[PDB]
Structure 1
């Protein structure tokens, strides 16, 4: 259905221990495709997906140049925010930035993002309207004033609606085997005694792409959201995702419980019983 491209930037000041550590990663949907680390030997933007490796030197030289610029902006940004917040020259701070675009099923522009956090709190964010800024505090109101003076929102909007979606579409085509795959989950169920008088049913979804999944337990078709053990969807580390949900079943109530699995890769949702 829908798709997204995201860039994530982390800059971390290490005062007295040289220049700040800057790390960048790019994703299409749940798939990493690029990285940059200020500390690594290459000083290159580097591929992390097979389907981007074949981009020629022009692509890589251009991404390297930009990521280096983004790195340098964050270096300055760490100084600015220090000033803004009247904070000690020594002390480690984190500047984070994310930007990217959503396309619908028709691969047309759906939403754009451009936002920052300082030390893990919201600093500034482009609003859904793609023209106004949310400024948390008075510090951000300074950024906001500057960006409003400079019509930053308009220039960004151009990227978000043009390049961002252009190159997302291009990547989805070039990575069609990986990026346009729906891998339905491999499911199974386990049963372990907890005591003389109650046992765990654990319902497993494995090896599925993308990460989006609905995994629920019903007792006589009534949902057990309050009584379900449900882990964070986690990466298997091969491009696929894992999840399970568990319920404690009192003795001889197994037949009352149904596991329901929903995923894009499933034509119709699974009901599983012990």
Structure 2
């Protein structure tokens, strides 16, 4: 289930005409390009070494698109100010997500095009890639405007065409690195909790991709147990743990299991004194 996304952001700045604009491209949830308007002279830059096999023409063409998007978001922010009847002395945020999911048979599985204003759903292209879901009264103005102009056809063309073709290009060009996994390294720690009770904490460290499943079992039955959100280690890998409160002396009846696509075999761990 390969994917490509572009996550874009414009933040207006009170007293300045130009918002800050930032675009980030992803393949399979990993950053591979980024554009930032606040840079010295802004360009799309490669965020993964395999992208450096793209030539000057590619970077120049992508950068000109960003310059376009930057203007597009500026006008849109000003329009939104009108629709919501807001004041110009504040900061406001416009975000966009777009891109595609590709199956193993190279069929487009889903196309995405979504906007948010002030961190709330504004308008989105439906799964049919033909019609719009507007989330509030203001967004209906945009919907009408975009239905009038046939905007959806433009995005459909991109999603069904360039998005899937270029993602395949990238998969081909970056295959080895794009398919690389890191296995989780797991261990169990033991902590006092209260009288008669202790905490077992099952750790998974150093894994990639971020997707993972941690489970606790009593005898051989699964449980429900504190589970932290998966978090970046800062070195390209991820961490997670799952803990359970168990009665003193029953620690050996509890077993942790770790499931990750990077492992050659699911892990089964117990607390080891």
Deviation of the 1:196 alpha carbon: 4.8
Aligned to 1:242: 239
* Greater CA drift, 231-240 or 85-94: 231-240
* Greater CA drift, 182-191 or 108-117: 182-191
* Greater CA drift, 52-61 or 213-222: 213-222
2: CA distance, partners of 1:88 / 1:28: 38
Deviation of the 1:241 alpha carbon: 1.6
Aligned to 2:54: 55
Q: Secondary structure of the residue that 2:39 maps to in structure 1? A: coil
Deviation of the 1:171 alpha carbon: 1.1
Aligned to 1:160: 159
Deviation of the 1:266 alpha carbon: 2.8
Residue 229 of structure 1 is aligned with which of 226, 230, 234? 226
Aligned to 2:83: 84
CA displacement, residues 112-159 of structure 1 (integer Å, 9 cap, x when unaligned): 100100001100001112111101112111111121122211221111
TM-score of the superposition, structure 1-length normalised?
0.94
1: CA distance, partners of 2:254 / 2:166: 46
2: CA distance, partners of 1:253 / 1:171: 51
Aligned to 1:210: 209
- Count of residues in Structure 1 that have an aligned counterpart in Structure 2: 271
2: CA distance, partners of 1:209 / 1:4: 16
Deviation of the 1:216 alpha carbon: 1.3
> Contact 2:4 / 2:29 at 8 angstroms: preserved in 1?
no
> Contact 1:217 / 1:260 at 8 angstroms: preserved in 2?
yes
Aligned to 2:267: 270
Which runs of 5 or more residues in structure 2 are unaligned? none
CA displacement, residues 198-251 of structure 1 (integer Å, 9 cap, x when unaligned): 2221111122221111111122233322xx111111122222221111112210
Deviation of the 1:267 alpha carbon: 4.0
> Contact 2:199 / 2:245 at 8 angstroms: preserved in 1?
yes
